[PDB]
C-alpha cells in the first residue's frame, strides 16, 4: 500500500465497484474545483439538453471570475458559446465562468440568481439519487460545499457512464471557435487540460483536478490498463505535483493488486 500526501484518498475498480485503496475515504472535506464534475454530470443528464444550443456570455460571468479570483476559460462577454464548448471550458481549464454559464442555462427560474439556486438544488438531488450521504453542494464551481474521496469517486463513476463526459475529460487540448457579436467566428486561445495525468500516466482517461484555500490540491483520476479501469480521488494533497504523484501511486497499486 502506497503512502500519499493527500489526507483523503480512495480508488475502486470502476467496472466492479470493488475498493482498491482507502485513506479517510469517508471523511468530509472541501472539494474546490472538483465540484465541476457534478455540474457537468447534471448538465449532461438534462432532459432538454442540446449540446449545440448557444449561450451568450454575460458580463456577470466575467465579473464573477474577477471578483472571486476564480479559474476561468476566458469566455468573452457578448460571444455565443455552445453547451458543448462550455463543457470543454468547464473541464479542461477548470472554467468557473463556464460553470456559471451552464448553471444559468440549465437552472430553472426567471433570474440568473434563481436559476443558479435551482441548479445547485439539482446538484444536491443528483447526489441524493446516487445514494450519497457525505456530499453537499452550495456552489456550481466549489462550509456547505463538501464531499469525500469515496463520494466524489462515485459521482465521477456515474458521470463516466456518459460518452460525451468521457470524450471531454480525456481531451488534452481544445480550441473553441465562438461566434462574435458581429457574427464573425473567433478562434479562442487553446484550452489545455489541467490534469497532468493525461500526459504522464499511460492509460489515463480522466477525470478532473481541483484546488482551493480550504480544499488544497485535489484530483479525481481514472485510467485503463489491461481491460481494467481504476477510478479514484485524492483530496487535500500538498501541491499539484504531489497530487499527481499520489494518484499515480494509487493507480499503480490498484493495477498491481
Ligand atoms: Cl487546480
Ligand atoms: Na482545477
Swiss-Prot record:
Coiled coil: none annotated. It is an enzyme of class 3 (hydrolase). GO terms for molecular function: serine-type D-Ala-D-Ala carboxypeptidase activity. GO terms for biological process: cell wall organization; peptidoglycan biosynthetic process; proteolysis; regulation of cell shape. It comes from Streptomyces sp. (strain K15). Pathway: Cell wall biogenesis; peptidoglycan biosynthesis. It is found in: Secreted. Keywords: Carboxypeptidase, Cell shape, Cell wall biogenesis/degradation, Hydrolase, Peptidoglycan synthesis, Protease, Secreted, Signal. This is D-alanyl-D-alanine carboxypeptidase. PANTHER family: D-ALANYL-D-ALANINE CARBOXYPEPTIDASE, D-ALANYL-D-ALANINE CARBOXYPEPTIDASE DACB. The active site is at 33 (acyl-ester intermediate), 36 (proton acceptor), 94. GO terms for cellular component: extracellular region.
